[PDB]
Design an enzyme around this catalytic site. Structure first.
Site, mmCIF file in Angstrom:
data_model
loop_
_atom_site.group_PDB
_atom_site.id
_atom_site.type_symbol
_atom_site.label_atom_id
_atom_site.label_comp_id
_atom_site.label_asym_id
_atom_site.label_seq_id
_atom_site.Cartn_x
_atom_site.Cartn_y
_atom_site.Cartn_z
ATOM 1 N N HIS A 138 24.347 24.306 -3.362
ATOM 2 C CA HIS A 138 24.069 22.504 -2.150
ATOM 3 C C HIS A 138 22.923 22.708 -1.996
ATOM 4 O O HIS A 138 21.670 23.510 -1.476
ATOM 5 C CB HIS A 138 25.019 22.954 -1.442
ATOM 6 N N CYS A 173 21.788 18.652 -3.718
ATOM 7 C CA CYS A 173 21.903 16.887 -3.020
ATOM 8 C C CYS A 173 20.991 17.442 -1.951
ATOM 9 O O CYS A 173 19.789 17.931 -1.605
ATOM 10 C CB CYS A 173 23.054 17.226 -1.747
#
Ligand SMILES: [Cl-]
Ligand SMILES: [Cl-]
EC number: 3.4.22.60
Lengths: 4, 228, 223, 4
Positions: free
Chosen positions: B89, B131
């Protein structure tokens, strides 16, 4: 679908 | 030859893959299903190029900084380059460890010329699946650095839970087909096109349904890079 | 064929140069001597590529946003690509206008795939000489739908943490290196080959670390 | 030499  | 990187070394180089799938409850970050396929596929396609690949799963922020610091302390005299793949992430300028976030530039700072003499004027490759801020959808870097981001800042980086992330799927697909032939930017450009045209998001939420993704290549390279 | 941008158009496209030299006192920024020589040199080496170059001087932030918005609303149907060159002061993520700062992404937003249909699937180049401190679908059909930030390329004179140098009597090293390579190899080398050499030329000048941010989906040859 |  998945997100990061 | 004078416009290419010297690839006449004993080995292509070291390749570290950080595969973060499970995270602590305090982070509130869900399981990244499909990243195991990514890590294994990346292990295959990067070994095919001639890299010495090692994979670590669920690393903490301290661990990630440590293994990259230890890597830059190794002797890369007989190596052509260095590669590092991050799968986790993330937000703007940061990537998630199992216990929180850590700045990406801190991870790459170890491989700067003043801290890693044996990799001076050799390409350092950083592939990042994460991301980078989603509001739409500091140690400086150096020359001979390349960042292959899965997405553009402000946009999502998608991942199929049953097939893997779009960026990794495309990356190894191009590398297995043309990895020995094409220059690094040619490969990454085809990865850009593959992600941009072949994929669209799936969701019963129409707001997050059929969304698009374009990867982002940041190159500070001074020469052309062929893996052969 | 399918790996290169289609360059078979009536014209290569428009190239807009924003040359900011004199800044308002409230900006706290000094005069950028030598940028006039950059703009003139860039005018020549880009006209030779086939671009229709337009030069603006000392633009305010509203002025920069307006002219780029107007340009994105022009008909680029018979154009192969678009180019924009920014010469000014700069901090992180922002460029300096005559009266202050404006987000770089606000400038480039006008040319996104959903806002500029005539430049859809076409290269959109942004060359930025400055310091850097330290949404709809493009189509209703999923088969033609592409990311809005696709086909963008950014050529920065430096990276955050380093300075972008400029000679008051000669101009910036980045522009000189850029034009020189464009004169020699602008008609035979791919865009990344050209810019990679630019990075090397400025590097061997010795700090300043030029970089390229590419969202291109094809190879770019100026043919 | 000046900076930007
Ligand atoms: Cl998994
Ligand atoms: Cl001047």
């Amino acid at each position: 679908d998945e997100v990061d | 030859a004078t416009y290419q990187y010297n690839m006449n070394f004993e080995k292509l180089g070291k390749c570290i893959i950080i595969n973060n799938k499970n995270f602590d409850k305090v982070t509130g970050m869900g399981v990244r299903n499909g990243t195991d396929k990514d890590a294994e596929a990346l292990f295959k396609c990067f070994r095919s190029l001639g890299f010495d690949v090692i994979v670590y799963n669920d690393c903490s922020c301290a661990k990630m900084q440590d293994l990259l610091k230890k890597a830059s302390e190794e002797d890369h005299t007989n190596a052509a380059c260095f590669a590092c793949i991050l799968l986790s992430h993330g937000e703007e300028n940061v990537i998630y460890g199992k216990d929180g976030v850590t700045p990406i530039k801190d991870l790459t700072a170890h491989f700067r010329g003043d801290r890693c003499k044996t990799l001076l004027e050799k390409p350092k490759l950083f592939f990042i699946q994460a991301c980078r801020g989603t509001e739409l959808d500091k140690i400086p870097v150096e020359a001979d650095f390349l960042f292959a981001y899965s997405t553009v800042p402000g946009y999502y980086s998608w991942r199929s839970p049953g097939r893997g992330s779009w960026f990794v799927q495309a990356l190894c697909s191009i590398l297995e087909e043309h990895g020995k032939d094409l220059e690094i930017m040619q490969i990454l450009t085809r990865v850009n096109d593959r992600v941009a045209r072949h994929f669209e998001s799936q969701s019963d939420d129409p707001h997050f349904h059929e969304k698009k993704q374009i990867p982002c290549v940041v190159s500070m390279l001074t020469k052309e890079l062929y893996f052969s």
